[PDB]
């Protein structure tokens, strides 16, 4: 019959830093056993201090992106100020519960800066719960990426290894290596990488290619 869902895939990564938020994602849009394109960035710049990525069903990703932009403009044009990160998190959670009985089949990650100027990653689920964490991997490559970030960021399951805070460039090298290592084994991953970095001075972007198969 008509099915309302299809799995487009995707891979979204986020890291909460000391004063930074790094969000990176591949740009492959595929379906079944074919490739639609090799250029579709899942990352989107909302404000100067907020970047969202959306994987899963692609049409709901586009629609949700547009509705979120609309409500951003509503809040600013009503209240003369931009949102914080957690306010956007609460708003997205209320929307995802507002379509409870016909869900968005979409994974969501909001990264950005708080009002203290520190990194804050809000993870999500297709029904609309959320929490402030340091790092998440969204998409089909979630399990391929989470234990390595437990190894490096959390320093978990290690002995006599002290806690050094994560710098910027080390995190960049981490993101490049984890997407290479996941692109070696995942099929929904490759050809590019759209890396977005949130500082206290704006948004930086950077495109790192991958293997072409």
């Amino acid at each position: 019959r008509f099915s309302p869902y299809v799995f487009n895939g995707g891979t979204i990564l986020a890291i909460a830093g000391e004063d930074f938020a790094i969000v990176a994602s591949d740009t492959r849009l595929s379906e079944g056993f074919s490739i639609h394109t090799r250029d579709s960035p899942k990352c989107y710049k909302l404000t100067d201090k907020t970047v969202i990525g959306c994987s899963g069903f692609h049409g709901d990703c586009l629609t949700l992106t547009k509705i979120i932009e609309a409500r951003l403009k509503m809040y600013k044009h009503s209240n003369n100020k931009a949102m914080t990160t957690g306010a956007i998190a609460a708003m997205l959670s209320t929307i995802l519960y507002s379509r409870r009985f016909f869900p968005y089949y979409v994974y969501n990650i909001i990264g950005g800066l708080d009002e203290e100027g520190k990194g804050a990653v809000y993870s999500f689920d297709p029904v609309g719960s959320y929490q402030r964490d340091s790092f998440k991997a969204g998409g089909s490559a979630s399990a391929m990426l989470q234990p390595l970030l437990d190894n490096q960021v959390g320093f978990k399951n290690m002995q006599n290894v002290e806690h050094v805070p994560l710098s910027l460039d080390r995190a960049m090298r981490l993101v490049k290596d984890v997407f290479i290592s996941a692109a070696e084994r995942d099929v929904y991953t490759g050809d590019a990488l759209r890396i977005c970095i949130v500082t206290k001075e704006g948004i930086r972007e950077e495109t790192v290619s991958l293997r072409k198969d």
């Binding site: 689920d125 029904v127 964490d133």
Partner: protein
Amino acid sequence: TTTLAFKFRHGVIVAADSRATAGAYIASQTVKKVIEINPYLLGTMAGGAADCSFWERLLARQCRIYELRNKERISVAAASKLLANMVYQYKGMGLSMGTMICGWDKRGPGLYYVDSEGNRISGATFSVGSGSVYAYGVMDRGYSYDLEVEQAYDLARRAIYQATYRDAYSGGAVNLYHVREDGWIRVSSDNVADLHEKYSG
């Protein structure tokens, strides 16, 4: 997932794990399940996250409106009653929600149990989740009314340790809240591995 709650002479003990998986895949280890409703009300997250979060936030809204209209702090049975009447309006439509309602009352301590099946009851001990029966066993071993404060703390800590030990769907940090007569207070947030080293020998 395993929560429990038991009241005694000096208020109410509330403890839970922080593991919330996605089927056979663990999503997180640090899910703060015990939702802070007010400076005087505490709800938990028991089976399904979005329903617990949304309907307890709506309950907090309605409690604040009640207080601002009546200049008066709401009772606990009131909160369980409003929550059951709100949730019962979607019966059969597939909401999973099994939280508990705790708070201090003019009658004193308050402990109610609200399901998405609408099973609004009071009681003295409760435990919700997949590994809840483990917690029932170890708590009803260790239950009395005349316990002390550190006794109840170590009791609930032992309880969540046993529940996360035998069940696979439970783990993470062990939260521990304590309701008083004036207001609730976070006691601790203990990790399981520390408790295993501490209690194993």
